[PDB]
C-alpha cells in the first residue's frame, strides 16, 4: 500500500513517551509518518488542562497541512502517547516524490478526508450529548481496547477520573459524583478506579 516506496529515504528519530512532536505556533517544514506505535492529538488553553480530540495509531501521517500552501503554522499539539517510531521528510523533498509517484499523494490526501469528518463530529458531541451521555460511550470504547480487562459480569477498566474529563470535557468531580449516581439505580459498579459495567457481552 502506502508503505511501498516511501520508507526508503526517511530519517528515523523515535520519540519517547510524553514527548512533543508538534508545537502549535512553529512553522511546518517537516512531514511525519507513523510506523509502529500510537499517538494522541490534543490542545491546551491558558491554564494547563488538556483536551484530547482523537487517537491516531500506526499507518497515519502527522502534520501534513503545511504542504500545499507554503508559510503556515502548526494547528494542534501532537503528544506521543507511547513509544512510537516516526520518520521525517521535508516538504521540499516530498514534492519530488510525487512527480515520480503521484500515488503517494493519493494516499495522504485520502486520509485528510476522514480526519476532516471525525474532527467535525467531535464538536457536535460537545453540544448535544451531556456529561452522562459522553462518559457512557467512553466506557464501551475503553472496553474494546486491547488493554481492557474482561469480567464475568461485564467489563473492567482502569482509568483515572482526571483523564476522563480530558476526553468528554469536564471536571474530575462531576465524573465521580455521577459515577456513583448510577450505582443507586443498579446499572454499574465502582471501587476506586475499577469500573465494572453491566449489559456488555
Amino acid at each position: 500500500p502506502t508503505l511501498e516506496w516511501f520508507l526508503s529515504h526517511c530519517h528515523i528519530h523515535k520519540y519517547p513517551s510524553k514527548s512533543t512532536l508538534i508545537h502549535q505556533g512553529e512553522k511546518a517544514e517537516t512531514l511525519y509518518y507513523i510506523v509502529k506505535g500510537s499517538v494522541a492529538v490534543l490542545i491546551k488553553d491558558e491554564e494547563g488542562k488538556e483536551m484530547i480530540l482523537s487517537y491516531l495509531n500506526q499507518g497515519d501521517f502527522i502534520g501534513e497541512l503545511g504542504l500545499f500552501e507554503e508559510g503556515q503554522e502548526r494547528s494542534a499539539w501532537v503528544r506521543a502517547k507511547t513509544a512510537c517510531e516516526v520518520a521525517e521528510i521535508s516538504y521540499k523533498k516530498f514534492r519530488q516524490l510525487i512527480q515520480v509517484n503521484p500515488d503517494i499523494l493519493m494516499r495522504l490526501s485520502a486520509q485528510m478526508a476522514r480526519r476532516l469528518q471525525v474532527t467535525s463530529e467531535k464538536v457536535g458531541n460537545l453540544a448535544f450529548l451531556d456529561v452522562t451521555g459522553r462518559i457512557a460511550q467512553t466506557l464501551l470504547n475503553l472496553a474494546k481496547q486491547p488493554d481492557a480487562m474482561t469480567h464475568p459480569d461485564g467489563m473492567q477498566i482502569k482509568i483515572t477520573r482526571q483523564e476522563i474529563g480530558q476526553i468528554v470535557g469536564c471536571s474530575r468531580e462531576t465524573v465521580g459524583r455521577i459515577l456513583k449516581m448510577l450505582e443507586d439505580q443498579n446499572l454499574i459498579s465502582a471501587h476506586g478506579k475499577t469500573i465494572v459495567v453491566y449489559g456488555t457481552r
Binding site: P146, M149, T150, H151, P152, M155, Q156
Partner: protein, 108 residues
C-alpha cells in the same frame, strides 16, 4: 375471517409502523479458532501452564477471563498480556463468544 382482516389492515389506514423482514443471511464461520494454542508462538513456560489448566485450543482460553486466571498460583499478568498481544493479529480477544464449539469431538 379475522386472519384475513389482519391481512388488509394496511389498507384501512391504521397506525401500525412495523418493518416487514430485515433479515440478512450469509452463513460464515471462523475455522481459525479451531486451531491449537501452538500457533501463537509461546514459551515453554506458558506452553506447560495452559495445557495443565485444560487448555489445548485457543477457544478454551478465550472463554475464560483474565480476572479468574490470576487466582491460580501457576499464572500471572504477564502470561495473559502476552497472549492478547498475539491474538491482536489473529483477530481474537478475551471476552468473546464462540460458535460451533467444541469442534469435531466424540459426540455420544
Amino acid at each position: 375471517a379475522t386472519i384475513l382482516a389482519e391481512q388488509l389492515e394496511a389498507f384501512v389506514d391504521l397506525r401500525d409502523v412495523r418493518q416487514p423482514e430485515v433479515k440478512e443471511e450469509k452463513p460464515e464461520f471462523d475455522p481459525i479458532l479451531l486451531r491449537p494454542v501452538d500457533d501463537l508462538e509461546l514459551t515453554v513456560r506458558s506452553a506447560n501452564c495452559l495445557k495443565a489448566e485444560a487448555i489445548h485450543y485457543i477457544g478454551d482460553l478465550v472463554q475464560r477471563t483474565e480476572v479468574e486466571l490470576l487466582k491460580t498460583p501457576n499464572l500471572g499478568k504477564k502470561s495473559l498480556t502476552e497472549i492478547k498481544d498475539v491474538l491482536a493479529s489473529r483477530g481474537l480477544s478475551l471476552g468473546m463468544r464462540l460458535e460451533n464449539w467444541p469442534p469435531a469431538s466424540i459426540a455420544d
